[PDB]
Amino acid sequence: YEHVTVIPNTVGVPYKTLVNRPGYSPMVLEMELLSVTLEPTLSLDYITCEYKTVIPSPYVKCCGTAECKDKSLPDYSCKVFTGVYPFMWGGAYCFCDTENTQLSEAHVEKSESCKTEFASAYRAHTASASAKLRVLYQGNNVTVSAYANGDHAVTVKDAKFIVGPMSSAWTPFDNKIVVYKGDVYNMDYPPFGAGRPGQFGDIQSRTPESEDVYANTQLVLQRPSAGTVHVPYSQAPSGFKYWLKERGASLQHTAPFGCQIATNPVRAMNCAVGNMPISIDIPDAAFTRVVDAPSLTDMSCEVPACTHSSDFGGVAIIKYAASKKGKCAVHSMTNAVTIREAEIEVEGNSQLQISFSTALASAEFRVQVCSTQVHCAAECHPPKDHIVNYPASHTTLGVQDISVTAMSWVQKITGGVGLVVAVAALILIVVLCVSFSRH
Amino acid sequence: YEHVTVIPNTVGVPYKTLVNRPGYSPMVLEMELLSVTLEPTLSLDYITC
Ligand SMILES: *[C@H]1O[C@H](CO[C@@H]2O[C@@H](C)[C@@H](O)[C@@H](O)[C@@H]2O)[C@@H](O[C@@H]2O[C@H](CO)[C@@H](O[C@@H]3O[C@H](CO)[C@@H](O)[C@H](O)[C@@H]3O)[C@H](O)[C@H]2NC(C)=O)[C@H](O)[C@H]1NC(C)=O
Known part of the structure; x- marks a missing residue:
């Protein structure tokens, strides 16, 4: 028997x-x-990390003029400064006083730390959904791990479980994401080769080990101070370090629907979004014939207490006369009331106790026990606690569900006015009929 | 659970x-x-003897 149902994608709530x-x-x-995971397919555009500026010992050409050469290094800059008169600890370096030039050069390289400390710029594609489901089957709860794509059926205890596809394609991850460590960010990182100084992506490489490096740091060489051999420059500070200080909150803390975010691999977990279709192939051996099953008669229901606490705050006592010893399934006939017990044992003439959760001020529901239905009714009280650390075990109330006492008042008032109108309407009709008849 | 009630100040009578x-x-x-005591705060003015 193939059974198809749909459950909410809320995790940790039994249905x-x-x-x-x-x-x-x-x-x-x-x-x-127990767990729902959305794992995006990622493509790496580039790696962003801290850059180092490499400045080879400056060449001082004494009694002559130095010349520049063009190199292909990532952000190479070279300039010749005339009129330099550098001194060392032991005195002047150059023999000539004015015929002296300094050749200063520098380039940007990825730092040695880029193999460990870096952020990866990824493109996100359609995610592969996966889920772990706990199913109470034949009195034994078995864990099923399967892909939520409507395929890849998993069979446990000779029952086939198919989960998904998801009713929603929503993901917390945008098309462009950046991953630093355990923190995933949604940002529109710049195109490769088009980074900007002082900003994330100022230095880029395709992979941590790649020698292909783009850099835009505005590395401008400046003239050395008089009497020195140092090489001054004006360069924008690493955009990676600035970004690390200005990262802001990660998706782990900002994502909608209470999504949990993790990396290695990148995952969105337990997002309370939409619902998940489930199809179960149940073997014939799992079913008991109606004639073989216990049958209940002479059922009655009373509710000693009820509080709509959202934590199974109601308890119903149902009296029954069983045809024989055995087990019966228990199910609520209304979404308004959720019953914790899925099955009970019935023996002769006795009573059963079940717990339930409802949002209703007046609990009006029917309980089916192995094909026999009994009507239950109760006045449910509000909880004293305002806040709890767990999601409601029941569904929403709706406008259609009002207390019986309140319903009575509504009908009394509505009927009171409706009756006055009906009387006034009759009087007018009689007068019009008489006025019509006379001529 | 906080329960608030009021009883008479009469002593020796259970409610x-x-x-x-x-x-x-x-x-x-x-x-x-069992006992209700009203203890006035006093300030000594003087001693007579
Ligand atoms: C199969 O397992 C489920 C789920 O139980 C969870 O997973 C198990 C493998 C264990 O690790 C459990 O510790 C874990 O909670 C069972 O449903 C749940 O059973 C637990 C008790 O095992 C219920 O918690 C108890 O609730 C009472 C309430 O008065 C407390 O006094 C206890 O201290 C304890 O907290 C839990 O509420 C219940 N889940 C629901 C929705 O009611 C399931 O019964 C079990 N089935 C079989 C055949 O073993």
């Missing part, structure tokens, strides 16, 4: 689905998502 | 208050004043 195969006793499966 | 907390069986507490 009950009723399996109804005609001729067989109803069965209830409890399914809970 | 019963019902603590009705929905979801739990009703609890009844019996309270009796």
Whole structure:
């Protein structure tokens, strides 16, 4: 028997689905998502890291003039400064006083740290969805790990589980992401080869080990101070270091829908988005015939207490007369009320206790136990606590669900006015009919 | 659960208050004043003898 149901993509919240195969006793499966992972396919555009500026010992050409040469190094700059009169600890370096030039050159290289400290600029593509589901089957809860793509069926305990596709293609990751370590950021990083000084991407390489380096640091060489051999320059500070200080919050802290973000691989986990279709192939051996199953009669329901606490704050006691010893599935006939127990044991004439959770001030629901339905009703109180550390076990209330006492007041007032109108309408109709008749 | 009730200041007479907390069986507490003391703050003016 192939059973197809849809559950919310909320993780850590169990949902009950009723399996109804005609001729067989109803069965209830409890399914809970333990983990949902969206893993984007990534393509690396480039690596951003701190740059180092390399400045070879300056060449001082004494009693003559130096010349520049053009090199292909990533951000090479070279200039000749005339009129230099450098001194060393032991005195003047050059014999000539004015016929002396200094050849200063510099270039930018990726630092030695770029193999460890770097940020990777990735392009994100359609994610592969995966999920871990806990299913309570035949009284035994089995963990199923499968891809949420409507394919890649996984069979456990001779039952085939197909999960997905996801009802939503939403992902916390944009087309362009940057990964530093455990922190993933959504930013429109610049094109490769088009980085800007002082900003993220000022120095770029395709891979950490690549020798192909782009750099735009505005490395302008300046004239040395008199009497010295130092090589001054004006260069924008690494945009990587600036970025590290100005990163802001990562997606782990900013993502919508409570998504958890992790790296290695990049993952979005437990996003409360949309829902997940599930199809279960249940073997015939898993079903008990209606004639073989216990049958209940003379059922009645009472509710000693109810609080709409969102934590199974209601308890119902149901009296029954069982035809024989055995087990019965239990299912709520309304979304308004969620019952914690999926199955109970029934023995002769006795009573069963089940817990339930509802948002309703007045709990009006029907409970089906192995094909026999009993109507339950209760007045539910509000909780005293304002805040809890767990998601509601029940669904939303809606406008259609109002307390019985309030409903009575609404009908009394509505009927009161409606009756006055009906009377006034009748009076006018009678007068019009009489006025019409007379001529 | 905070329960607020009021009893007479009469001493030696037990009073019963019902603590009705929905979801739990009703609890009844019996309270009796054994002693009530009003101790005035005094400032000595003088001694007569
Ligand atoms: C199969 O397992 C599920 C889930 O239980 C979780 O996973 C297990 C492998 C263990 O690691 C558990 O520790 C873990 O919670 C069972 O459902 C859950 O069972 C636990 C108890 O094992 C319930 O928690 C208890 O709740 C009572 C309430 O009064 C507390 O007093 C206890 O201290 C404890 O917290 C938990 O509520 C329940 N889940 C739900 C939604 O009710 C499941 O019963 C089990 N099935 C079988 C056949 O083993």
